[PDB]
Amino acid sequence: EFLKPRLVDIEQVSSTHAKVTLEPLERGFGHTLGNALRRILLSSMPGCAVTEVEIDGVLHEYSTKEGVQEDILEILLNLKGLAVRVQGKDEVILTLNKSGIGPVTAADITHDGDVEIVKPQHVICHLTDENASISMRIKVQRGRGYVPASTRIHSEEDERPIGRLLVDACYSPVERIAYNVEAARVEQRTDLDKLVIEMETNGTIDPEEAIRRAATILAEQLEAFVDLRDV
Amino acid sequence: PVERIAYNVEAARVEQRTDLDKLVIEMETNGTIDPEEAIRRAATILAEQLEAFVDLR
Amino acid sequence: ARVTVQDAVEKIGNRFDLVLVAARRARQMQVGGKDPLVPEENDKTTVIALREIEEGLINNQILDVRERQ
Amino acid sequence: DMIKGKQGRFRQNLLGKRVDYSGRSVITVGPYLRLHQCGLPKKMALELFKPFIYGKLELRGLATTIKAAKKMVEREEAVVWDILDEVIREHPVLLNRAPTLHRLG
């Protein structure tokens, strides 16, 4: 003798902002599921991000190119924010080549099949000289969480090329998660509640897949609990 | 049937990663069911509600 | 860890030669001339000797009789 | 002159020296601790207990000779942390704060 929650309509207000609803939730499980999901989403969602960059005419992060106004370090800082969706491979090499005066935005990346540039207007640099030309190759990996350069330095693995520029990896697409349990008038019941989870992401992970994966992880840990050895 | 329930979380490290934790759950029940099986049906209940979404298997 | 030595000082009320007898015992234990009379729980030899003292098995006189024997 | 005077002997010789196996650093709260314990950084603990580490490593046979013990400590493999954990169990350390007003300093 129980009820059980069914995934219902998933409204999309913007590309980044989303509302997901769960209608038939038993009394008391509203807050439990809300909080559990919030934790799993904020903590464990896998994403892809740039790990290191090689630009041609630059020895180290602190030098400067002719005809650009940003420092190289600020260029890395801009790349850290680049939101990209990789489908098949784990490590992709994107190529950016632009010349002439203008703002080098993310759209100018060489269009590959498997990679989706979510925000093509996102700026990267500004050229300021007719003959100034920038070429670069950005290596993008898949991962979970937050990994800084300095920890990965232990596993250098022949970092010998001085042209390599390491970037801290924020392997996480979800920026914000909130949930509300509000009275769910079901046609034959008195006191039932519906959970509405509104989530804001960088526009890479789709809501359905996020929620499914989170529920998967929590269910897996519960599976670990079901059996008890006592041996 | 549970008269008292509490859980402490404390630091535990796997030889390189220190930011991992151990969960010690102290539970007192009122005789009827023994604690192991109580935990059993608790985890069971939460899993049946979650069951509807989880499909990656 | 053995957080209090109160019972060991209650065995010998000087609270100073306690340290001496425990040091002699733990030194006989570390340099492996002797063996512990208590089942060790991964303690080091200092806390082992204190644990032995608090259980009444070892004092100065037992040390003297065993050494001359 | 060698005997008498400050610079010579007693007044300076056996009055205030720098000792070994000692370290210094900033203090922090750590509420989860038991009353009889203290949080100690890995790296400081390794540096302090270096010779203990070498002795225990050689006792366990993980290292043939002492130089191999240094090389294994400077690589910092899992065995080193396990031995450090094993030696630390009951070994107590002394904590001191610059103005030791009374004996509880």
UniProtKB/Swiss-Prot annotation, chain C:
EC number(s) reported in the record: 2.7.7.6
GO cellular component, one term: cytosolic DNA-directed RNA polymerase complex
Superkingdom of the organism of origin: Bacteria
EC main group: transferase
A biological process term (GO) from this entry: DNA-templated transcription initiation
Entry's Gene Ontology molecular function annotations: bacterial-type RNA polymerase core enzyme binding; DNA binding; DNA-directed RNA polymerase activity
Tagged with keyword Membrane: no
Catalytic activity: RNA(n) + a ribonucleoside 5'-triphosphate = RNA(n+1) + diphosphate
Keyword tags: DNA-directed RNA polymerase, Nucleotidyltransferase, Transcription, Transferase
Keyword Calcium: no
Family, as annotated: Belongs to the RNA polymerase subunit omega family.
Subunit organization: The RNAP catalytic core consists of 2 alpha, 1 beta, 1 beta' and 1 omega subunit. When a sigma factor is associated with the core the holoenzyme is formed, which can initiate transcription. The rRNA transcription and antitermination complex (rrnTAC) consists of RNAP, NusA, NusB, NusE (rpsJ), NusG, SubB, ribosomal protein S4, DNA and precursor rRNA; S4 is more flexible than other subunits.
Functional note: Promotes RNA polymerase (RNAP) assembly. Latches the N- and C-terminal regions of the beta' subunit thereby facilitating its interaction with the beta and alpha subunits. Part of the processive rRNA transcription and antitermination complex (rrnTAC). The complex forms an RNA-chaperone ring around the RNA exit tunnel of RNAP. It supports rapid transcription and antitermination of rRNA operons, cotranscriptional rRNA folding, and annealing of distal rRNA regions to allow correct ribosome biogenesis.
Name of the protein this chain belongs to: DNA-directed RNA polymerase subunit omega
Source organism (scientific name): Escherichia coli (strain K12)
Gene: rpoZ
Residue span relative to the full protein: 2 to 70 of 91
